[PDB]
C-alpha cells in the first residue's frame, strides 16, 4: 500500500537548510504554493484549450485556502493540471530546478525569501509545516497522496481520502508555534501582500 523513497542528496540537503536556518521572515511560504497552484491552473487552462474534454473533471479555475484550528492544518486547493504518480515521485523528491543554485545563491548573500527564483518554492512550506501532505488527481491517473516529515525520506500511496474531480491539495500539519497561519486576519494580511495580483479567484474558508 506505500511506498517509501529517500529524497534525492540535494534535496535532502535544501530541506535541512530550510528547516535548520534561523529565519524568522517565514510567512512567504503562502506565496509560494499559491503561485505553483496558479501555474498549475495555467497548465489546464492551456491545455483545455486544444481539448475541451479536459475540463470534464471541473470547469472552474480557483485556489481555496482552508485553515483548520482544530487538526493544526491549512490547505491550499487548486482545480489545475495535477499530477501522475510518476510526476509526484519525479518533482517532490527523486530529482533536482534551481535546486543548486538557490543553495549557493545563500552562500553568495541571497535569503531565503528569494527561493521562488529557483523554482523550488514548494519547500519553503517547512518553515512552517512540521508534515506535508500532497494530495493530487490528474486526468491521466488515479488520486495518489505523497507526504514527508523531511528527515530524509517521502511517502507515496493511492489516496483513499475524498475524490476530488481533478487539481492539488496541499496540507500543512504546522508546527506548534506557527499557528498564527491559521488567523483570518494573518492570512488575508499575507496574501494581500504578497498575492494580491494572482488571476484566478483565491477564497479564505472561514471556520
Ligand atoms: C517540488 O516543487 C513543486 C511541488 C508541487 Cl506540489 C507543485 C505543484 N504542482 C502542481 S501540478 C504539476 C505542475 O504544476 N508542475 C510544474 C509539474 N500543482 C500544485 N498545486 C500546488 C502546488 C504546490 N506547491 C503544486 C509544483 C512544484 O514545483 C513547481
Same mark, same amino acid.
Given at each position: 500500500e506505500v511506498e517509501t523513497f529517500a529524497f534525492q542528496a540535494e534535496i535532502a540537503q535544501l530541506m535541512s537548510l530550510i528547516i535548520n536556518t534561523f529565519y524568522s521572515n517565514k510567512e512567504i511560504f503562502l506565496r509560494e504554493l499559491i503561485s505553483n497552484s496558479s501555474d498549475a491552473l495555467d497548465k489546464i487552462r492551456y491545455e483545455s484549450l486544444t +481539448?475541451? %474534454? /479536459? #475540463?470534464? %473533471? $471541473? /470547469?472552474e479555475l480557483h485556489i481555496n485556502l482552508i485553515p483548520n484550528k482544530q487538526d493544526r492544518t491549512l490547505t491550499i486547493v487548486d482545480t489545475g493540471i495535477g499530477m501522475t504518480k510518476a510526476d509526484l515521485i519525479n518533482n517532490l523528491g527523486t530529482i533536482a530546478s534551481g535546486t543548486k543554485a538557490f543553495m549557493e545563491a545563500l552562500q553568495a548573500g541571497a535569503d531565503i !525569501?528569494? *527561493? $521562488?527564483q529557483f523554482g523550488v $518554492? &514548494? =519547500? %519553503?512550506? =517547512?518553515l512552517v509545516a512540521e508534515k506535508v501532505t500532497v494530495i493530487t488527481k490528474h486526468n491521466d491517473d488515479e488520486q495518489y497522496a505523497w507526504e514527508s516529515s523531511a528527515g530524509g525520506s517521502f511517502t507515496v500511496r493511492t489516496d483513499t481520502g475524498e475524490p476530488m474531480g481533478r487539481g492539488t491539495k496541499v496540507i500543512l500539519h504546522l508546527k506548534? +508555534? @506557527?499557528?498564527? =497561519? #491559521?488567523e483570518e486576519r494573518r492570512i488575508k494580511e499575507i496574501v494581500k501582500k504578497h !498575492? @494580491? &495580483? *494572482?488571476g484566478y479567484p483565491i477564497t479564505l474558508f472561514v471556520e
Open positions: +481539448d475541451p %474534454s /479536459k #475540463l470534464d %473533471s $471541473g /470547469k !525569501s528569494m *527561493i $521562488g $518554492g &514548494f =519547500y %519553503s512550506a =517547512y506548534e +508555534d @506557527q499557528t498564527e =497561519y #491559521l !498575492s @494580491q &495580483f *494572482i
